[PDB]
Paper text:
Successive assemblies of Endosomal Sorting Complexes Required for Transport ([name]-I, -II and III) largely mediate sorting of plasma membrane receptors at endosomal membranes, the formation of multivesicular bodies and their release into the endosomal lumen. [name]-I subsequently recruits [name]-II, composed of Vps22, [name], and Vps36, which in turn activates [name]-III subcomplexes. Two recent crystal structures of a core of the [name]-II complex reveal a trilobal complex, containing two copies of [name], one copy of Vps22 and the C-terminal region of Vps36. The human and rat homologues of [name]-II were originally identified as the EAP complex (ELL Associating Protein; Vps22/EAP30; [name]/EAP20; Vps36/EAP45), associated with the RNA polymerase II elongation factor ELL in the nucleus.
Here, we report the crystal structure of full-length yeast [name], composed of two homologous winged-helix domains. [name] consists of two homologous winged helix domains as detected by the program GRATH that are arranged in tandem. The N-terminal domain 1 (residues 1 to 126) contains two additional N-terminal 3/10 helices, implicated in the interaction with either Vps22 or Vps36, followed by the canonical helix 1 and strand 1. It lacks canonical helix 2, which instead folds into a large disordered loop followed by strands 3 and 4 that connects to helix 2 (at the corresponding position of canonical helix 3). Domains 1 and 2 are tightly packed against each other and their C alpha atoms can be superimposed with an r.m.s. deviation of 3.4 Å, confirming their structural relatedness. In the unliganded [name] structure, this helical segment constitutes the 1192 Å2 dimerization interface of two identical [name] dimers present in the asymmetric crystal unit. The dimer contact is mediated by hydrophobic residues Pro5, Pro6, Val7, Phe10, Pro11, and Pro12, which is similar to the contact region described for [name] interactions with Vps22 and Vps36. In the [name] structure Arg83 does not participate in dimerization but hydrogen bonds to Thr15 instead of forming salt bridges with either Vps36 Asp548 or Vps22 Asp214 as observed in the [name]-II complex. Therefore [name] seems to dock as a rigid body onto either Vps22 or Vps36 upon [name]-II complex formation. Surface electrostatic potential maps of [name] reveal a negatively charged surface within domain 2 that is characterized by a patch of conserved residues such as Glu153, Glu170 and Tyr152.
Author numbering:
A (entry chain A): 1 to 55, 73 to 113, 116 to 155, 158 to 201
B (entry chain B): 1 to 52, 74 to 156, 159 to 202
The structure:
Amino acid sequence: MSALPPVYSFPPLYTRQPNSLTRRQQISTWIDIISQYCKTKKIWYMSVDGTVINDKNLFNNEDIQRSVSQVFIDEIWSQMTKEGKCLPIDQSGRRSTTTTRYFILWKSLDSWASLILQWFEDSGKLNQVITLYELSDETVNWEFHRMPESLLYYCLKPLCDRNRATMLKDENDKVIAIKV
Amino acid sequence: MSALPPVYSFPPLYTRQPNSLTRRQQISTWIDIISQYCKTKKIWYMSVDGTVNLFNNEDIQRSVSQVFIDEIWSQMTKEGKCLPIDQSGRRSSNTTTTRYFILWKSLDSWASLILQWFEDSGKLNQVITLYELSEETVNWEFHRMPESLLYYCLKPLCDRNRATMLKDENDKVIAIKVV
């Protein structure tokens, strides 16, 4: 129960800082604000310009009348990407081939992998075949509930490695369900 | 969460901001940094100048002006995030407040957690001292809290008629019973 910080309204933050050292910190702060934000609002996608997609822009502070330059924002993303805090995706899968938006990873993919895997066991379904769609129905209500399927797919992949699961695709080789 | 946020190293923060609006936020950010710091390092006292220090960033080579710091404290005091005290107990600004009791947890809040322990330990009728309350049965967030400050968290219990305090020959609260 938190979302946006008090520093989120501190102007000097929106101004990029000339200084390898400083900028390095300032960016972390932003990285951090992002995760915390998406996390509490249970959001998953962020457009490169900061727009939030809903299963509303975080770099444009209306109240403070300030906005982070795209130039900086980009620095923010890469940095966040280098750190594994976000995932570059295009009109669908992992791409940073015209990456259009980001999958904010406040929880590692492997981490999500576990929590989902967990669910499966903590619900005995550890042998059945459930779809990704139902993965986000009434039965689910762990942090990952409502997570897009495309992104859900990336959280399950870890289960395919670690040989704990097998995915099932439809006629158009699209993952639709999975058995763990 | 560490003792210091990433913003703790963001210079612009140490510079006071000319602006009722802005400063107001900047201060909250500092208030916040303090609580969070003290909380995780399980610290309780902070000297007005910041000695825990926390206002003098060595790595960043930057330090908040006392002027600002004072604004920080009052603001933090208005909010009830801290408690002003002289070498003794609660003591107002001028009235020689020498240090602060950082309230990362409201007094009423602490009040509850302590009350809680009592019930969660059935001792809800006995007479335990503040010393034992701080120093081998206690291990909730309040474990190790100074007695003087512990006293202020129990007071709420005297109000709400849930407890009675017992002082020694030198009218010093030593124990308490919170039936």
